[PDB]
């Protein structure tokens, strides 16, 4: 079914409040939201094409993994947080992407067009494919919303890492885990149980 709006709205408000004032308590809530009431996987995200970006990364970028994706989404989340907290600062109206840790964590892991799409939701557009800049007036609510989905994305990577750990002896790839998680609305233990049973031949 649909995502729980009340739970999501409450979590969003607490996420913004937290940053305006460790996010582990927020991550526990996010982990609950991502499986709550058997929300369909295709309703977990509305601004990022999460499972498509993940599968593109795992298939196309050889250094990647769910761990690497966690790091890329975390770095992009921090870009968003800085922008909605400090939109007047030159260092966040123009961001550093062609050199520095952004190369190692994001360019290594997400396709260029997915970087561009995610950054566009924050109002960043590039020049010559780089030099991302906020060229129109900031829309902090939109920045907050995509930052929040990058937070959910990093947590969802944590969920899929956990699914894999619970069925780690059966020879599955991370791509196999992603396909179960996007196909089934079960929680983490449900997904791992299904993967185990399938590997055992029990359907």
Author numbering: 5 to 25, 38 to 219
Sentences from the paper on this structure:
The linear ubiquitin chain assembly complex (LUBAC) regulates immune signaling, and its function is regulated by the deubiquitinases OTULIN and CYLD, which associate with the catalytic subunit HOIP. We here show that CYLD interacts with HOIP via spermatogenesis-associated protein 2 (SPATA2). SPATA2 interacts with CYLD through its non-canonical PUB domain, which binds the catalytic CYLD USP domain in a CYLD B-box-dependent manner. SPATA2 also harbors a conserved PUB-interacting motif that selectively docks into the HOIP PUB domain.
A crystal structure of the SPATA2 PUB domain (aa 7–219) at 1.45 Å resolution revealed a fold most similar to that of the extended PUB domain in HOIP (root-mean-square deviation [RMSD] 2.4 Å) (Elliott et al., 2014) and the smaller PUB domain of PNGase (RMSD 3.2 Å) (Zhao et al., 2007). Species conservation of SPATA2 mapped onto the surface of the PUB domain reveals that while the PIM pocket is highly conserved, this interaction site is also very different from canonical PUB domains. The previously mapped PUB-PIM interactions include a conserved Asp-Leu/Met-Tyr (see below), in which Leu and Tyr occupy a deep, hydrophobic gorge on the PUB surface, the PIM pocket. In SPATA2, this pocket is significantly different from both HOIP as well as PNGase structures, and modeling of interactions with PIM peptides derived from OTULIN or p97 would generate steric clashes. Consistently, the SPATA2 PUB domain does not bind PIM peptides (see below), suggesting an interaction motif in CYLD may need to display distinct properties. Nonetheless, the high conservation in this area did suggest that this surface may mediate CYLD interactions, and single amino acid mutations in or near the SPATA2 PIM pocket interfered with CYLD binding. In particular, mutations in the “lower wall” of the SPATA2 PIM pocket (Y114A, T115N, and T115A) decreased CYLD interactions, while mutation of residues in the “upper wall” of the pocket (N98A and T94K) did not have strong effects on CYLD binding. The strongest effect on CYLD binding was observed when we mutated Tyr114, which points away from the PIM pocket, supporting that CYLD binds the SPATA2 PUB domain in a PIM-independent manner. Indeed, the CYLD USP domain (aa 583–956) and SPATA2 PUB domain (aa 1–241) formed an SEC-stable complex, confirming a direct interaction.
